Design a protein around this nucleic acid. Structure first.
Lengths: 76, 76
DNA sequence: ATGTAGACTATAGTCGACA
DNA sequence: TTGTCGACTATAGTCTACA
């Protein structure tokens, strides 16, 4: 599947971990269902941008740091 | 009305007019549908990442660049 | 904590027509 | 050239439940 989608997932995980949160934690804060989040980390589902906008806000990270991390990441 | 969303659409249209592509022109290059590229650009309808990613390709815009451009457009 | 399965519902995308 | 309307098909995002 998608080159990007995967990298995205890979960044979310890292952030989520750094912050030391469990999946259900974030699910709550993001107001998403836990399962979805698993799908995202493990298998890189597609998510929508409304979905991302929640999760950014769930990790309590700036929609700017994410993207930044994301770039250095994308850089291989 | 997702902040992140309108800020995604704007960049799309910006890139598209710079590249002087038409929406149809985009529709082709993104293997996606005119009416949708319409919806995104015009009324904050909610694309996904695969959709996004395709779009970057339709614009012939490197992901890095898109996000870079994007970032800057938040910070206004 | 996390992964996954399946039934389900909501909304992402397709298409063809016409201001 | 692009937005909108309406009826489509496709899937994202939920939920229960068990290893």
């Amino acid at each position: 599947e998608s080159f990007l989608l995967s990298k995205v997932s890979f960044v979310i995980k890292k952030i989520r971990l750094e912050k030391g949160m469990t999946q259900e934690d974030l699910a709550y804060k993001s107001n998403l269902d836990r399962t979805f989040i698993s799908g995202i980390e493990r298998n890189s589902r597609n998510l929508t941008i409304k979905s991302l906008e929640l999760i950014m806000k769930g990790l309590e990270v700036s929609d700017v740091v994410f993207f930044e991390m994301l770039i250095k990441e994308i850089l291989k």
